[PDB]
Amino acid sequence: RHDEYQYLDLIRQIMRTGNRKGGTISMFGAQMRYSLRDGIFPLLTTKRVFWRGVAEELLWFVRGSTNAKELQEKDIHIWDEEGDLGPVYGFQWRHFGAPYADMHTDYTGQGVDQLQQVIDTIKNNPDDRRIIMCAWNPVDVPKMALPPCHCLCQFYVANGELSCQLYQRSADMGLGVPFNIASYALLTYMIAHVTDLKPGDFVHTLGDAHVYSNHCEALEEQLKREPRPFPSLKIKRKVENISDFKFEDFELDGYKPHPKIKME
Amino acid sequence: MRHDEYQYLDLIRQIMRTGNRKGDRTGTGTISMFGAQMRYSLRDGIFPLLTTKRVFWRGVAEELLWFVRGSTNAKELQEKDIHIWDGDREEGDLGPVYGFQWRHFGAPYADMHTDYTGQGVDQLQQVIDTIKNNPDDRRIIMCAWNPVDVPKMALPPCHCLCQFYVANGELSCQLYQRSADMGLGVPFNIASYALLTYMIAHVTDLKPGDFVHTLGDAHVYSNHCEALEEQLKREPRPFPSLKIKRKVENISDFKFEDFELDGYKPHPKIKM
Lengths: 264, 272
Hints:
The structure is a homodimer. Chain A is of the alpha+beta class and 264 residues long. Chain A has one domain (1-264): 2-Layer Sandwich (Thymidylate Synthase, Chain A). The first copy, chain A, has helices spanning 5-17, 51-62, 69-72, 89-95, 114-124, 176-194, 216-223, and strands at 19-21, 24-35, 132-134, 150-158, 161-172, 198-212, 232-235, 250-253. In chain A, the strands form two sheets. A six-stranded mixed sheet of chain A has the order 1-2-6-5-4-3. A two-stranded antiparallel ribbon of chain A has the order 7-8. Chains A and B meet through strand 2, strand 4, strand 5 and strand 6 of A and strand 2, strand 4, strand 5 and strand 6 of B.
């Protein structure tokens, strides 16, 4: 059975048994597993996902950037001094615990580079149960433009496979969740590549999983759609370091989704 | 619908049958799987204290009261005949563990005798305030996973984060556990966070809802497999009930004697 049915079964479950709040219908605690094996990329097909946005945003995080203008430059308006987002994902991943000044500050060697630490642990001690990258910083969350939805991610190694689990505190089943699946499925592919492992699974754990009430008629239309086979993902060239990836290095073959649906 | 303990039982079974073997099968070795989720109802006084093996209730409750106090002193537990934390600072000093991260996240750690009052982020009192003032908030998080403090701890925390949720006058909790020993660990962990939810529900005038247990590396120790096979032959019994005997104003004001665990009828303990 197609992995995308876990996502639809949850929307269906939320709209039918979920808790209405004042405007969302929500449930607490969910878990999906997406296979990343044999080049399979879980880019959801019942609605078109902004692939370029997914990839460019992740490359921006990997760079350590806290400057929204660097994304606006790539005609990505998902994150719209001016452009200064505070110590968000890119800063937490590369410089956890460092004092935040501004987006122009050179933070090289400041704080914990969790991304490089997780990569080193996968190579030197793959059986380690502490391969975690945490963006949820209780000290820095009030300094951030928006508090992180993606709290932490854990990685696991078995039979030459790299697996990743994301903890998402807040999940919009409409627009949010498909983009979130792709971001962390791409991160796994990138870390797998630099650590000489094959991608395994992407485990998506949700806290407050919800649908917006004004999106329900559109979700009813989307629930009527049959998932199509997922596209394939290839990294065109040998990338030595995680910071060395470019959008052009990714080869997304066979992405054939159903049309986009308006969810205001 | 079907006994909640069957989620825990089915997972042990699934791990021992299809799990991945790591390390030395002579002792330290494990059989593991990655990514799991259980849901335990806490409604109508139900307390999910596992019944196929007796769980150390007094250990669960005393350890949690010690975390709430913000203590990092293992001697305070030993004093209450709790030796769960027995296995270059002073004896009993565990470093910046759970108690510290919950009450003083971000504060620099010196020793277990240092007065940290007003230092760091009090996440436990923050979750209380948010539940009371804005129950619909999706940022009701208490994080013990501190990348900065993890190298200076005796043991890195297994219980990374927990999130709280409010709907229909019910408080639910979700725990993210990075490493879960299915044998001894996991039942104690279910009880610990179900008890925390009961305490927070009490001081915030809410009713307990669900305890959602999310796992990262879910594992059984190879030397515990014989004992787990014997446990799998056991049928779960109805869960006990939990009542808080008196009205407790603040989370720091609970005592072991305040808890009333009625009808806990487990199967005998198994050596692991």
